[PDB]
């Protein structure tokens, strides 16, 4: 049995109607769960035999469906139904569909940060790039040095979406040495995002 | 109501074995099977078997059979899973769960809290916390942004707070990138008006449990 979840990803706005789809390959049954999952916890049961509601589960939660195909509806999206949503069958799950808040655009609010004197000191150089409070998630970030394209000496990482005020923020960290970080002058971080008419460029002078 | 309560995060090195238990309490422990699914760190779920604590007969998935060993203890209502021959790829969230009815058994109306367990060749180390201080360059309007630079742990997780905890608003901690290293390295930052920067002190408070690493920072201009 594969049960193929669809769409991967759903960004709809609160008080609206979602519904996800769940598709089960080799499935004569009515059998079939659905779960909530919220960063940093445990899943949370919504829905079994298809349609009943899990303990603790409100009623704009719905599912419907049987033998291959299946449907979970959020009849008005509160703020709190915003998560990462599995079905199964059997021992089988599928691979997730992230439903996440649509609000309106928001620029990022960016900021950068030389390396501090005491890391420094030990001989290491990383470079910090802030992009604070943003949406949509999609956002594009390029280090470059004396305005050459660096690639392979950064890493990053994004925030869940906010609870309150549903953004995004992204910290992008370029590593050097000491000795390399020396040779150069001019550190800059560009970004795109679509709140941005053309791509904003933060930068220092060692 | 009932409760599974699972054993604590463990570290391990591939070819070690791991084992970890659930508790449970609030309803007839041989009653119910239970399952163990677990969760890879950015992924999905993925069950592993179910054992029955009646009989101690098992049922494991196809992909672990002769890796994976459950059993059970009555007497304290504890269900064990041990699994061997670790590898980095077995990196996750373990969970105990139970199903909510009998006759199909699937519907996980209970889970554990889950037991991180991290596989690596690593070693426990500290982080470095190395400031990241407000400057023009962090500043838009009259508010600027600071932060911390936790670098170079093992294992997750680190805990970090500003001023004690006294501080919350403004504040994005952000998910641990695992280096090339083997060591993990994550930032905390916060936003706070420009103006106070001169008065208010700003301290990261950095705690790593598994090295008993406490560290504090103070973030200046």
């Known amino acids: 049995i594969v049960l193929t979840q669809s769409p991967a990803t759903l960004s709809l706005s609160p008080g609206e109607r979602a519904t996800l789809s769940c598709r089960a390959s080799?499935?004569?049954?009515?059998?079939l769960a659905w779960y909530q999952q919220k960063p940093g916890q445990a899943p949370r049961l919504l829905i079994y035999?298809?349609?009943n509601r899990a303990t603790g589960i409100p009623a704009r939660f719905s599912g419907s469906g049987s033998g291959t195909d299946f449907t979970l509806t959020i009849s008005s999206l509160e703020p709190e139904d915003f998560a990462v949503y599995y079905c199964?069958?059997?021992?089988?799950f599928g691979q997730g569909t992230k439903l996440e808040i649509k609000r309106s655009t928001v620029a990022p609010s960016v900021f950068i940060f030389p390396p501090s004197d005491e890391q420094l000191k030990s001989g290491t150089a990383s470079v910090v790039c802030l992009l604070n409070n943003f949406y949509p998630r999609e956002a594009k970030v390029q280090w470059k040095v004396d305005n050459a394209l660096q690639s392979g000496n950064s890493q990053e990482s994004v925030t869940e979406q906010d609870s309150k005020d549903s953004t995004y923020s992204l910290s992008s960290t370029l590593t050097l040495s000491k000795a390399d970080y020396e040779k150069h002058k001019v550190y800059a971080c560009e970004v795109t995002h679509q709140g941005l008419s053309s791509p904003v460029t933060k930068s220092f002078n060692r | 109501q009932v409760q599974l309560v699972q054993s604590g995060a463990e570290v391990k090195k591939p070819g070690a074995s791991v084992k970890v238990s659930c508790k449970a309490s609030?309803?007839?422990?041989?009653?119910?099977?239970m399952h163990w699914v677990r969760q890879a760190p950015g992924q999905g779920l993925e069950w592993m078997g179910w054992?029955?604590?009646?009989?101690?007969?098992?049922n494991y998935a196809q992909k672990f059979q002769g890796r994976v060993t459950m059993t059970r203890d009555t007497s304290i209502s504890t269900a064990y899973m041990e699994l061997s021959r670790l590898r980095s790829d077995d990196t996750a969230v373990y969970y105990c769960?139970?199903?909510?009815?009998?006759?199909?058994?699937?519907?996980?109306?209970?889970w554990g809290q889950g037991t991180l367990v991290t596989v690596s060749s690593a070693s426990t180390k500290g982080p470095s916390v190395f400031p990241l201080a407000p400057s023009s360059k962090s500043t838009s309007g009259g508010t600027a942004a600071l932060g911390c630079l936790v670098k170079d742990y093992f294992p997750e997780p680190v805990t970090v707070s500003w001023n004690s905890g006294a501080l919350t608003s403004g504040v994005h901690t952000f998910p641990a990138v695992l280096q090339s290293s083997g060591l993990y390295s994550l930032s905390s930052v916060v936003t706070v008006p420009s103006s106070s920067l001169g008065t208010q002190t700003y301290i990261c408070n950095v705690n790593h449990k598994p090295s008993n690493t406490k560290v504090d920072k103070k973030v200046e201009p």
């Open positions: 769960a139970r199903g909510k009815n009998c006759d199909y058994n699937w519907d996980f109306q209970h």
């Open positions: 609030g309803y007839t422990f041989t009653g119910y099977y």
């Open positions: 054992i029955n604590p009646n009989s101690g007969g098992t």
């Open positions: 080799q499935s004569v049954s009515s059998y």
């Open positions: 035999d298809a349609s």
């Open positions: 199964q069958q059997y021992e089988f």
